[PDB]
Structure 1
Amino acid sequence: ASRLYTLVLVLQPQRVLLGMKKRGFGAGRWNGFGGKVQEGETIEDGARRELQEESGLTVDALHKVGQIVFEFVGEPELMDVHVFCTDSIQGTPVESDEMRPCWFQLDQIPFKDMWPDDSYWFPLLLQKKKFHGYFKFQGQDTILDYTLREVDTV
């Protein structure tokens, strides 16, 4: 019914790393780094792997910060996205054919050029809160309905 994905935010005291996706689903928007979890891999190992594939960065400990389920009306599969944060990385962000990473000051997060749900949950992430969300979309621009609640255990 739902397929596992990961999303990783590199969030430091004064800045966050986002990646401008160049191709495929969400192309043209800034977001964290993530993708599909593989056969035989834990969700956390998938999150670590996707961060390196998409940003060139190495993370050790990842912290669970959220779960968000996406529904696209007309599409059978739900995306079950496991969201993680880290403040501690190694390497320099690398630009590839798939992704252009840029640091942003926290008061300059480019919400108009991000998926619209991010305006709801990113501010929770900035204040070190944890959350469970559901967003029902029509196409990629319209939130038909949503729920979002803070939790103590992701």
Structure 2
Amino acid sequence: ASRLYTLVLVLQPQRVLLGMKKRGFGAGRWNGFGGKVQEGETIEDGARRELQEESGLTVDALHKVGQIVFEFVGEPELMDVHVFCTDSIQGTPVESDEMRPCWFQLDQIPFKDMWPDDSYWFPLLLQKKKFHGYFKFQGQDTILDYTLREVDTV
């Protein structure tokens, strides 16, 4: 049993857009844009919607770059996070109730202030390799187990 989530990384040649999460889950950490996938929308539509809701950005097209399953010790449901990237955004990022956007250079990504797993799979993201990840967490800071493999289709 798992719940679908989306995650969107606005990746441009020399920079990436991240949102400081202001309230709730993953608060105080930089991350891509996303959330729960709703009933009546595709995974890609939920990703575009969550990008719009959190950053005010529309996009020409999104591409599937990976799937990461997260297990939290004690919680029965897994988080099945579908990851997306994009280059051509439309408009300028604006602050929402959830997210404060900010550009970062690719060698200045604040992994110390992000979900610890990001360290592991970002390199594949930057290399444009598709991937399947799994991370078993104890609380929000400790990875107990993980797997990570290159794939051909997500």
The two structures have a TM-score, normalised by structure 2, of 0.98
Unaligned runs of 5+ in 2: none
Unaligned runs of 5+ in 1: none
Query: Equivalent residue for 1:24?
Result: 24
Could you list the per-position Cα deviations for residues 54-79 of structure 1 after superposition, in whole angstroms to 9, with x for gaps in the alignment? 11100121100000000000001100
Q: Report how far residue 152 of structure 1 moved.
A: 1.0
Asked if the contact 2:54/2:97 (under 8 Å) is kept, the reply is no
Query: Equivalent residue for 1:145?
Result: 145
**% identical equivalent positions:** 100
Q: Report how far residue 87 of structure 1 moved.
A: 0.4
Q: Report how far residue 141 of structure 1 moved.
A: 0.0
Could you list the per-position Cα deviations for residues 82-107 of structure 1 after superposition, in whole angstroms to 9, with x for gaps in the alignment? 00000011111111232100000000
Partner-residue secondary structure (3-state), 1:18? strand
Structure 1: how far apart are the matches of 2:108 and 2:31? 14
Partner-residue secondary structure (3-state), 2:107? helix
Number of residue equivalences: 154
Q: Report how far residue 40 of structure 1 moved.
A: 1.0
Structure 1: how far apart are the matches of 2:12 and 2:60? 15
Structure 1: how far apart are the matches of 2:19 and 2:151? 27
Partner-residue secondary structure (3-state), 1:45? helix
Structure 1: how far apart are the matches of 2:44 and 2:97? 25
Instruction: Provide the alpha-carbon RMSD of the alignment.
Output: 0.6
Q: Report how far residue 116 of structure 1 moved.
A: 0.3
Could you list the per-position Cα deviations for residues 1-49 of structure 1 after superposition, in whole angstroms to 9, with x for gaps in the alignment? 0000000000000000000000010000000000011111000111100
Structure 2: how far apart are the matches of 1:77 and 1:89? 33
Structure 2: how far apart are the matches of 1:63 and 1:96? 24
Structure 1: how far apart are the matches of 2:76 and 2:59? 33
The two structures have a TM-score, normalised by structure 1, of 0.98
Structure 2: how far apart are the matches of 1:82 and 1:151? 14
1:5-20 alignment runs, 5 A limit:
5-20=5-20
